[PDB]
From Swiss-Prot:
SUPFAM superfamilies: Ribulose-phoshate binding barrel. It comes from the Bacteria. One of its GO terms (molecular function) is 1-(5-phosphoribosyl)-5-[(5-phosphoribosylamino)methylideneamino]imidazole-4-carboxamide isomerase activity. This is Phosphoribosyl isomerase A. One of its GO terms (cellular component) is cytoplasm. Changing R18A: No effect on activity toward PRA. No activity toward ProFAR. PANTHER family: 1-(5-PHOSPHORIBOSYL)-5-[(5-PHOSPHORIBOSYLAMINO)METHYLIDENEAMINO] IMIDAZOLE-4-CARBOXAMIDE ISOMERASE (PTHR43090:SF2). CDD domains: HisA. Transmembrane segments: none annotated. Its EC number is 5.3.1.16, 5.3.1.24. GO terms for biological process: L-histidine biosynthetic process; L-tryptophan biosynthetic process. Pathway: Amino-acid biosynthesis; L-histidine biosynthesis; L-histidine from 5-phospho-alpha-D-ribose 1-diphosphate: step 4/9; Amino-acid biosynthesis; L-tryptophan biosynthesis; L-tryptophan from chorismate: step 3/5. The active site is at D10, D121.
Amino acid sequence: SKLELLPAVDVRDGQAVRETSYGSPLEAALAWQRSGAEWLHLVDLDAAFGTGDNRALIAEVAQAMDIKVELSGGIRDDDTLAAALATGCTRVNLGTAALETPEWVAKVIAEHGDKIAVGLDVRGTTLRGRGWTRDGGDLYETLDRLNKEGCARYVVTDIGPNLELLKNVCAATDRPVVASGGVSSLDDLRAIAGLVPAGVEGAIVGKALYAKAFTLEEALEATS
């Protein structure tokens, strides 16, 4: 299979953002869909950063989509997960919660299966979170724990792309790995697509698309 592309819409104060605002999240999502997106990666930055939420707006965006949706941002307990899942999204990403409440993450993996993917933010070989605990310990300890809890998928962010980290995570698991962040060129996407046989399934791309560095049409061509 070819590398999956997940164009992102990152939502802050009701807007698709980078500092720079790109206006309506709904319009942005529909534009990716019209340009051939198979996935939308929709992020609540306010919920992720603890400065409120965009829950109702994100629900509206998700409802408008006919393509697969991946939701992330502040999904840290039963009620926030319930709302997220009620969008009919294909899956959600849990980040901070994996670090802070490993028992809750284990529970929701058992209940929801591959509706759950776990986001791993790696500085070197240690993990980092957006909550109160800054140090999340050794990457490989957490991968082993989540592997054995039945975690269906990992989303991996370094700290263009850290191809060595991606391959190292692929070595440590038989679950699909999704690359996130550090894509700034079509050549970065080609390099990541070279890791598909190793177990990289997809790449999330935000910044470079809004900046008009490359178009989603160019991106899909490059990974075809």
